[PDB]
Scaffold this active site. Structure first.
Site, PDB file in Angstrom:
ATOM      1  N   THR A  33      43.752  39.237  69.911  1.00 58.42           N
ATOM      2  CA  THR A  33      42.770  38.476  69.152  1.00 58.42           C
ATOM      3  C   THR A  33      43.341  37.162  68.611  1.00 58.42           C
ATOM      4  OG1 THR A  33      43.337  39.927  67.298  1.00 58.42           O
ATOM      5  CG2 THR A  33      41.309  40.406  68.508  1.00 58.42           C
ATOM      6  N   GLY A  73      49.778  43.400  59.955  1.00 59.89           N
ATOM      7  CA  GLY A  73      50.642  44.303  60.697  1.00 59.89           C
ATOM      8  C   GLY A  73      52.048  43.747  60.831  1.00 59.89           C
ATOM      9  N   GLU A 100      67.324  63.156  62.763  1.00 56.63           N
ATOM     10  CA  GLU A 100      67.676  63.680  64.076  1.00 56.63           C
ATOM     11  C   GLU A 100      67.158  62.777  65.195  1.00 56.63           C
ATOM     12  OE1 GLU A 100      67.739  68.009  66.424  1.00 56.63           O
ATOM     13  OE2 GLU A 100      66.841  67.860  64.428  1.00 56.63           O
TER      14      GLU A 100
END
Ligand SMILES: CC[C@H](/C=C(/C)[C@@H]1C[C@@H](OC)C[C@H](O)C(C)(C)[C@@]2(O)O[C@@H](C[C@@H](OC)[C@H](O)C(=O)O1)C[C@@H](OC)[C@H]2O)CO
Ligand SMILES: Nc1nc2c(ncn2[C@@H]2O[C@H](COP(=O)(O)OP(=O)(O)OP(=O)(O)O)[C@@H](O)[C@H]2O)c(=O)[nH]1
Ligand SMILES: Nc1ncnc2c1ncn2[C@@H]1O[C@H](COP(=O)(O)OP(=O)(O)CP(=O)(O)O)[C@@H](O)[C@H]1O
Ligand SMILES: Nc1nc2c(ncn2[C@@H]2O[C@H](COP(=O)(O)OP(=O)(O)O)[C@@H](O)[C@H]2O)c(=O)[nH]1
Ligand SMILES: [Ca+2]
Ligand SMILES: [Mg+2]
Ligand SMILES: [Mg+2]
Lengths: 54, 428, 439, 265
Positions: free
Chosen positions: C179, C146, C254
């Site tokens: 973890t 990640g 936007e």
């Protein structure tokens, strides 16, 4: 409390309510860093294997 | 990161090794003939970590059995789960190692080591994705200690990017076979500090005191001692064998437990502490499991955790229980005794909970501590080493195998450095 | 119609992704087999939901999504589960061994070996697009993948797709469900490397979600499943404007123009209400004024912090359900006299409001009660910098002793990157202070 | 057992407070960097408010209200008194007003005799977590030992009857009774309740309390003029034991129970 830009469709609506007015690395660079890290790993493993050979 | 290769070496190594496989075969529902007979799929989810699949739904331990004499391995082959091991994975010599590190490491052991590596290589090569290795052995004898560490060195050479894990039994005069145990242990620790990623320090000194005092056994045997060891080994490998989030493989465990490469020597613990054939009728509460697992008298390294600070801790709870309670109790211990957990490693205690309890218990908990107090174990071995080495006593057994005095001096100084390195973080 | 590709990286990214897509399917009347009865156009269309879903000749509606993880077990659950038919196999990408909670391992070591495959799988989806807006990237801060692989992927996306906007949905580490001890390292390392590549990032602190599940859903010990269903409601409400007809936040660009005036300060705070337990037999249905006031309660925020002691740069209110503009304005007017809302002097004091008449969809057998109206507020406030302060401190504590540093150096990362990263965070924290504090 | 940390060694008030807590026996003091505390006696500058209330299993409290610096900084005080709707209205008690504040000088004050000397009034105000306002029954009159030279200042850096140049309230009443019990209470609650919505930790993850030192100057017509508020005040000797014990009583113990002399505004 001025409401600006009210837009309505069948799915819903949106608007803006104003309370008060105001007062990159190239591909080659990336490959280079990845390869430098790889080479440091290679070097570290080589030193280990050298130690083990002793 | 699935497969682990298990190696067991020498008398102590093979005897605790055999018990380990006996215990976890039962937990995974594997019978002594290698066929499954369990009522839960949780048993088979991660079984490939320790077992290969053969033919006809047969599961065979990824286990290699090594010794320099046939005796202990003949006994294993005859044991309750003896026929489960792969016949070709028994590798043994005839001469023995005479409780001598040098014979295991340099002479006798060197003659046998290639054949062990042949079997290791064969197991590793059919692994989808090898995690690394687990070695059981003692430090006090000659085969497990000397040849065990030779193997570790050889394995690291072929598999340098794999994790090396050991369950290492530390010798103690309270349960001594020979006077040379401190020599063998000091030479081994030297090897372990450099070539393993994680070592569970299983101290025969602590195992004895627990059997004698806590379990009230007047005459502890190796069997009683191994009962404690196999329960601990089951507990500390729980996160590897069953579905879970925390420390689910060898490398994640090391990343969580080892902040500095040399400081990877763990103090294990288990609760409730039980003798063989124990009654075991009242299940323990979560606060009871928790207080007991953290209690110094419960540690299996014969060190006082109260004299030091934890760098890191892993706790594994087993059985059906309230996770809310477990989280509360674990926070309670840390918050009420914050001084014992180094502040420069935030949140350094990690908790796991597995639904499946071990055999004979509704609830248990396994402790794994990286405490600066572990220096006491190495200091103890250093003392005994030095009392003899100052007079060069019993050295002739080693120089006769080609070793020089200077290798002892070097081993001793490296273990002293280790103690120093633990001490520097005990007050920092 | 302009397309959006979603990218889910690592366990957290993947599991949240699954929750989101399940919800998207329920919201758009799409079945797990990909069939969508409501859609009159077969094998094509340029409707608003076509920004997230493409179409085949069999009338199958396929997510413009890629799932990436360095070990197979989490994505295997997708491949075999309820929505297995939804995705085609080439979207679901797994390696053999993970990054072991090590940024260096996911970025340098393993990342180098799989990055080209992932990008080519992404090109596959992109070449199906007539006008790709860009990417929505879902990942944790704390994991090796990640953190490590995401920052590498972002860098290469800026290269392969220089024009396209990139939005993040990031899970910030919380010890109650974490973890790994080294999660603060991975968080700072990934933030440093990703900063210049991300146009707008929605940060979610697991602690906040955890406590909201405890206190409002009466869940004793929240699992990832509980957390992710709540998270996917918040994500859905944020992305709804891209998936449905409307006029506010209708394109990725936007989001930046409305929420992010200063490029580095691109972390809007999300606040959601109401979160009501499905177990309650008597639901007291909240009004517009009530759910709007809740948006200014720290307890409902995705990151616990205090917006009173910071300055707002922008504010967006995104309503779903029975809500009319009159009641929003009445609510905003009351709130202005009872709340500490201070905007920066170089910005208008105001709110952009979006209303979608469809009340939030909930998962059958979920923990969330259906409500008649809900709101997600997005406010770029300097107070979220409190989350960086907390992170930076934990990093400082470990780094001072060089704890765990060898794990990273061993993967070929230089120790200097640690300090380069911490410096960037020091500056980032300084930027917020200039904007939000006056003396 | 409760736990706390000290991050400001130089606080004379909170050194006693720390001294009092340990003496209770149910409080263990921790290293300054230990996050696992119940109470934070925080540093004066750049207190890490953002790091409080994120410890599972621990109710946390700090001895400072984030944002109260608007009251306690002179430059900040002027803007707040001028710009805020409820504080700017009615404000007849504030003199017209590095970075500096030049503010209208009181031409003539109340003058105690003998001496023809000047003085100021410092009151102590404690605000707890519930945002109750607790004035201290004892105030301190800091005096100039020298006759008014139309000496101008009473700060200890700048004692025939006044010991340490401190007249202790009771005597002042008698002087008011010889030579010559409202405006001070109105001033305290006016300032603090004004800033209530901005600083209150009512529903925060952590909580606050703070000791304030309100400095007053009285004039010829016995009208009270407020000069500034002190964020980190020190008590007067003999009043330390009393005051600090009350802080423990009402701001700490009230949240962290073991096993009056404040007027509630
Ligand atoms: C926290 C890490 C830890 C350090 C300490 C000091 C911890 C704290 C607490 O446990 C968590 C003690 C605990 O709460 C108890 C009082 C219930 C208890 O277990 O204490 C021990 C004695 C205590 O040392 C005095 C113990 O040996 C120990 O280790 O305590 C007797 C025991 O008889 C049944 C029981 O009375 C080392 O790992
Ligand atoms: N909210 C939420 N957080 C999650 C979930 N899964 C993991 N996390 C959090 O993510 C952080 C890092 O974990 P992962 O995403 O699992 O790690 P990863 O990306 O797979 O990286 P590696 O496994 O090391 O290769 C931790 O703080 C977890 O608490 C999830 O499903 N939901
Ligand atoms: N308008 C005024 N009229 C009369 N005297 C004044 C005055 N303004 C200031 N003074 C005198 O000068 C003193 C200055 O003290 P001031 O409160 O300004 O700084 P200080 O030394 O108390 C720092 P701290 O914030 O810690 O209290 C006043 O208390 C008073 O004695
Ligand atoms: N716990 C335990 N310790 C043992 C066992 N057998 C031997 N030991 C210890 O191991 C050391 C002797 O080593 P051993 O394994 O017998 O020698 P080896 O065959 O050459 O490796 C001594 O410290 C013994 O106390 C056993 O079954 N259990
Ligand atoms: Ca269509
Ligand atoms: Mg033996
Ligand atoms: Mg993972």
């Amino acid at each position: 409390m001025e409401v600006i830009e009210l837009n309505k469709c069948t799915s819903g609506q949106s608007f803006e309510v104003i309370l008060k007015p105001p007062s990159d690395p190239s591909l080659e660079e990336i490959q280079k860093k990845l390869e430098a890290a790889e080479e440091r790993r290679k070097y570290q493993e080589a030193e280990l294997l050298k130690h083990l050979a002793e | 990161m699935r497969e682990i290769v298990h190696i067991q070496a020498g008398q102590c190594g093979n005897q605790i090794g055999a018990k380990f496989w006996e215990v976890i075969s039962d937990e995974h529902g594997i019978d002594p003939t290698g066929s499954y007979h369990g009522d839960s799929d949780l048993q088979l989810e991660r079984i490939n970590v320790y077992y290969n699949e053969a033919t006809g739904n047969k599961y065979v331990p990824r286990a290699i059995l090594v010794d320099l004499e046939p005796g202990t391995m003949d006994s294993v082959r005859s044991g309750p789960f003896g026929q489960i091991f792969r016949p070709d994975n028994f590798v043994f010599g005839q001469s023995g190692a005479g409780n001598n590190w040098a014979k295991g490491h340099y002479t006798e052991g060197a003659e046998l080591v290639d054949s062990v590596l042949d079997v290791v290589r064969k197991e590793s090569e059919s692994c989808d994705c090898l995690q690394g290795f687990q070695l059981t052995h003692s430090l006090g004898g000659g085969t497990g200690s000397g040849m065990g560490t030779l193997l570790i060195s050889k394995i690291r050479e072929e598999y340098p990017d794999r994790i090396m894990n050991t369950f290492s039994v530390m010798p103690s005069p309270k349960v001594s076979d020979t006077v040379v145990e401190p020599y063998n242990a000091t030479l081994s620790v030297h090897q372990l500090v450099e070539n393993t990623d994680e070592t569970y320090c299983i101290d025969n000194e602590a195992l004895y005191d627990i059997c004698f005092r806590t379990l009230k056994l007047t005459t502890p045997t190796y069997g009683d001692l191994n009962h404690l060891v196999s329960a601990t080994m089951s507990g500390v490998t729980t996160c590897l064998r069953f579905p879970g989030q925390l420390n689910a493989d060898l490398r994640k465990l090391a990343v969580n437990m080892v902040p500095f490469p040399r400081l990877h020597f763990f103090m294990p613990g288990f609760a409730p502490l039980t003798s063989r054939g124990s009654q075991q009728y009242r299940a323990l509460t979560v606060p009871e499991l928790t207080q007991q697992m953290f209690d110094s008298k419960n540690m299996m390294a014969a060190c006082d955790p109260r004299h030091g600070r934890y760098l890191t801790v892993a706790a594994i709870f087993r059985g059906r229980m309230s996770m809310k309670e477990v989280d509360e109790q674990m926070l309670n211990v840390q918050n009420k005794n914050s001084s014992y957990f180094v502040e420069w490693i935030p949140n350094n205690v990690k908790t796991a909970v597995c639904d499946i309890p071990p055999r004979g218990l509704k609830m248990s908990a396994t402790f794994i501590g990286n405490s600066t107090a572990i220096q006491e174990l190495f200091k103890r071995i250093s003392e005994q080493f030095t009392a003899m080495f100052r007079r060069k006593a019993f050295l002739h057994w080693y120089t006769g195998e080609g070793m020089d005095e200077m290798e002892f001096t070097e081993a001793e100084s490296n273990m002293n450095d280790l103690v120093s390195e633990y001490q520097q973080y005990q007050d920092a | 119609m302009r397309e959006c590709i979603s990218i889910h990286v690592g366990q957290a990214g993947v599991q949240i992704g699954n929750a989101c897509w399940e919800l998207y399917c329920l919201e758009h009347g799409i079945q797990p087999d990909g069939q969508m009865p409501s859609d009159k156009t077969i094998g094509g269309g340029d409707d608003s939901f076509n920004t997230f879903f493409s179409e085949t000749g069999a009338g199958k509606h396929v997510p413009r999504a890629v799932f990436v993880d360095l070990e197979p077990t989490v994505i295997d659950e997708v491949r075999t589960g309820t929505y297995r038919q939804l995705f085609h196999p080439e979207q679901l990408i797994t390696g053999k061994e993970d990054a072991a909670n090590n940024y260096a391992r996911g970025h340098y070591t393993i990342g180098k070996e799989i990055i080209d495959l992932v990008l080519d799988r992404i090109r596959k989806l992109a070449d199906q697009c007539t006008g790709l807006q860009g990417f929505l990237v879902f990942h944790s801060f704390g994991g090796g993948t990640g953190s490590g692989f995401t920052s590498l992927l972002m860098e290469r996306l800026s290269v392969d797709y220089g024009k396209k906007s990139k939005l993040e949905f990031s899970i910030y580490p919380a010890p109650q469900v974490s973890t790994a001890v080294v999660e603060p390292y991975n968080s700072i390392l990934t933030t440093h490397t990703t900063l210049e590549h991300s146009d707008c990032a929605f940060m979610v602190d697991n602690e906040a979600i955890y406590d909201i599940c405890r206190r409002n859903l009466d869940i004793e010990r929240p699992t990832y499943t509980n957390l992710n269903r709540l998270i996917s409601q918040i994500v859905s409400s944020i992305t709804a404007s891209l998936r449905f007809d409307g006029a506010l936040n209708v394109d990725l660009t936007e989001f930046q123009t409305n929420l992010v005036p200063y490029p580095r300060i691109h972390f809007p705070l999300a606040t959601y209400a109401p979160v009501i337990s499905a177990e309650k037999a008597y639901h007291e249905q909240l009004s517009v004024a009530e759910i709007t006031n809740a948006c200014f309660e720290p307890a409902n925020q995705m990151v616990k912090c205090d917006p009173r002691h910071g300055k707002y740069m922008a504010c967006c209110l995104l309503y779903r359900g029975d809500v009319v503009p009159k009641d929003v304005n009445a609510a905003i007017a009351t709130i202005k006299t009872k709340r500490s809302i201070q905007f920066v002097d170089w910005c208008p004091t105001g709110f952009k409001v979006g209303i979608n008449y469809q009340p939030p969809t909930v998962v059958p057998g979920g923990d969330l009660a259906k409500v008649q109206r809900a709101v997600c507020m997005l406010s770029n406030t300097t107070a979220i910098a409190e989350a960086w302060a907390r992170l930076d401190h934990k990093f400082d504590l470990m780094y001072a002793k060089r704890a765990f540093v060898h794990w990273y150096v061993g993967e070929g990362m230089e120790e200097g990157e640690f300090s380069e990263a911490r410096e960037d965070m020091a500056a980032l924290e300084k930027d917020y202070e200039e904007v939000g504090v006056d003396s | 057992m409760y736990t706390f940390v000290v991050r400001d060694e130089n606080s004379s008030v909170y050194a006693e407070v720390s001294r009092l807590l340990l003496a209770t026996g149910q409080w263990k003091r921790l290293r300054k960097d230990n996050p696992r505390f119940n109470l934070m006696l925080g540093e004066r500058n750049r207190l890490p408010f953002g790091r409080l209330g994120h410890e599972p299993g621990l109710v946390q409290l700090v001895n400072y209200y984030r944002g109260a610096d608007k009251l306690c900084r002179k430059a900040s005080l002027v803007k707040l008194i001028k710009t805020s709707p409820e504080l700017s209205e009615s404000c007849t008690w504030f003199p017209e007003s590095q970075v500096h504040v030049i503010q209208k000088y009181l031409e003539k004050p109340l003058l105690l005799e003998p001496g023809h000397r000047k003085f100021d009034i410092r009151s102590w105000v404690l605000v707890d977590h519930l945002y109750n306002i607790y004035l201290y029954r004892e105030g301190v009159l800091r005096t100039s030992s020298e006759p008014y030279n139309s000496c101008h200042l009473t700060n200890h850096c700048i004692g025939r009857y006044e010991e340490g140049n401190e007249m202790f309230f009771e005597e002042f009443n008698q002087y008011l009774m010889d030579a010559l019990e409202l405006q001070i209470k109105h001033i305290i609650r006016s300032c603090l309740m004004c800033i209530e919505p901005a600083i209150s930790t009512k529903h925060l993850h952590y909580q606050s309390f703070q000791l304030f030192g309100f400095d007053f100057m009285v004039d010829e017509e016995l009208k009270v003029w407020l000069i500034e508020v002190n964020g980190a005040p020190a008590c007067a000797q003999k009043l330390y034991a009393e005051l600090c014990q009350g802080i423990v009583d009402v701001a700490i113990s009230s949240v962290f129970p073991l096993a009056s002399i404040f007027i509630k505004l």
